Amino acid sequence: YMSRYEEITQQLIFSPKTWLITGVAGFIGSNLLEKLLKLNQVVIGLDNFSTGHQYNLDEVKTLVSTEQWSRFCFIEGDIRDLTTCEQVMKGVDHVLHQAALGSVPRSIVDPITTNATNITGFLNILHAAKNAQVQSFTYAASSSTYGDHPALPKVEENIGNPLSPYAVTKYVNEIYAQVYARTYGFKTIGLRYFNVFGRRQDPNGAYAAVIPKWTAAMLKGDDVYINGDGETSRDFCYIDNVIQMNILSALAKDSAKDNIYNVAVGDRTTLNELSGYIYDELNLIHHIKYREFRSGDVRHSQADVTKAIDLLKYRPNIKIREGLRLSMPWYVRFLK
């Protein structure tokens, strides 16, 4: 049971607030939309359809009431444009900032646009939100911020050096939000995601995340690619934990704000294990080559989530396997 989360969502269905989801056509963004619309919440959406998709918002309209869908006001626009950020904040209570160009590799190959989106775009929104005096400001941060710190599990106080531009930007994000707290009193919540997967994560692109990429590959009957040895271990996190975390961070009390929280499950799964999980969770619905390490890529990842458990009462209920089983059917429909 996601106890506190449930309570917090009851509050929401009672006093609906106006939410801003930057990156709303994205994987996490669109999921927050689906949840938030079902919570009878008025959602202002912002997205420029870079990695995001019409077919995500389109999908969400499939899954919410007509009455609920009319509470959604989509805006096509750019967090890089400050004005846009100011337009969208009007009347907003809670800001769920999810818009960025993730991918460690992308950042290495184009750190310039990455910077514009992940830093400029982040600061623009952060500032627009402050000036609007929104009630909450929760932003997507990243577990790559840990960088080269050797310790496991990964605890918040304990970050090392960044290994990619992408890490820099997300670390920069975290830095600004502290400065905005210290100098403006604008208390925010950073969410250090660890490899979120689930419904609407893009299986296509050179920058596809492991889980969808490999799923797509098995469904086409193509080769499944393993970068390095395969023992590269990760804390995979089903979207519902992320959705949970955002909402809990939106309505966190003041004393738990100006804080970064690992969003994961505390589990550690290597790529050799995962490939097994996916194959097994896919063959239940009726249907491999090793290469060199990705550069900039962190070696091991396992989240310590006790902070979220303690301060926000986050209960990560869905582990990797349970989440994969919840995820496959969506990919089957999306790729048939």
Ligand X SMILES: CC(=O)C[C@H]1[C@@H](OP(=O)(O)OP(=O)(O)OC[C@H]2O[C@@H](n3ccc(=O)[nH]c3=O)[C@H](O)[C@@H]2O)O[C@H](CO)[C@H](O)[C@@H]1O
Question: Any known ligand binding at 115?
Answer: no
Taking CB under 8 A as the binding criterion, the range among 27-35, 158-166, 270-278, 305-313 that sits at the site for a second copy is 158-166
Question: Any known ligand binding at 331?
Answer: no
Instruction: List Cα–Cα distances, 90 to 18, 32, 43, 130, 188, in angstroms.
Output: 9, 20, 12, 11, 18
As a dihedral over the C-alpha atoms of residue 237, residue 118, residue 165, residue 213, rounded to 10 degrees, the angle is 40
Site string for a second copy, 93-122 (x = CB under 8 A): ---------------x--xx--xx--xx--
Helices 239-250, 3-14: inter-axial angle, 10-degree rounding:
60
Is 209 one of the binding residues for ligand NAD (CB under 6 A)?
Answer: yes
Q: Which does 245 bind (CB under 5 to 8 A by kind): ligand NAD, a second copy, ligand X, none?
A: none
Q: Which residues contact 150 (CB under 8 A, 6 or more apart)?
A: 160
Instruction: Return the residue of 90, 182, 220, 333 that touches a second copy, per CB under 8 A.
Output: 182
Q: Which does 99 bind (CB under 5 to 8 A by kind): a second copy, Na ion, ligand NAD, none?
A: ligand NAD
| 8 Å CB contact between 140 and 125 | no
CB-wise, 17 or 307, nearer to ligand X?
307
Instruction: Return the residue of 9, 18, 98, 136 that touches ligand NAD, per CB under 6 A.
Output: 98
Question: Any known ligand binding at 78?
Answer: yes
Is 194 one of the binding residues for ligand X (CB under 6 A)?
Answer: yes
Q: In whole angstroms, what is the distance from residue 251 CA to residue 244 CA?
A: 11
Q: In whole angstroms, what is the distance from residue 321 CA to residue 134 CA?
A: 37
Site string for a second copy, 291-320 (x = CB under 8 A): ----xx------------------------
Segment (H or E) for 226 = strand 225-227
